[PDB]
């Protein structure tokens, strides 16, 4: 959160409320949730010999 040196002090109260990742990213619950279509690969000819 921070770094301190002798004589330095932090003192605070944080309030946590409910919300959706739409009005601020901090409230978003997933790193990423993407999707991808399944690739399809077809060998039209028998590949061989290096």
């Amino acid at each position: 959160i921070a770094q301190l040196r002798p004589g330095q002090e932090i003192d605070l109260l944080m309030h946590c409320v409910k919300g959706i990742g739409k009005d601020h990213a901090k409230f978003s619950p997933v790193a990423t949730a993407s999707y991808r279509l399944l690739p399809d690969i077809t060998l039209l000819e028998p590949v061989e010999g290096e």
Binding site: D11, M14, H24, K26
Partner: protein, 45 residues
């Protein structure tokens, strides 16, 4: 009990009306006001 930290000595000097603005234990002429505990509210956005 208004405290001011020296510029390089870092001694707490309390200054008032009618008195000069030098620092004790040295003689420097710049002194920073000190942060007291007062409540401030910030938003995390």
């Amino acid at each position: 009990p208004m405290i001011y930290i020296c510029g390089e000595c870092h001694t707490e000097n309390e200054i008032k009306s009618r008195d000069p603005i030098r620092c004790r234990e040295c003689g420097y002429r710049i002194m920073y006001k000190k942060r007291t505990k007062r409540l401030v509210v910030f938003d995390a956005r």
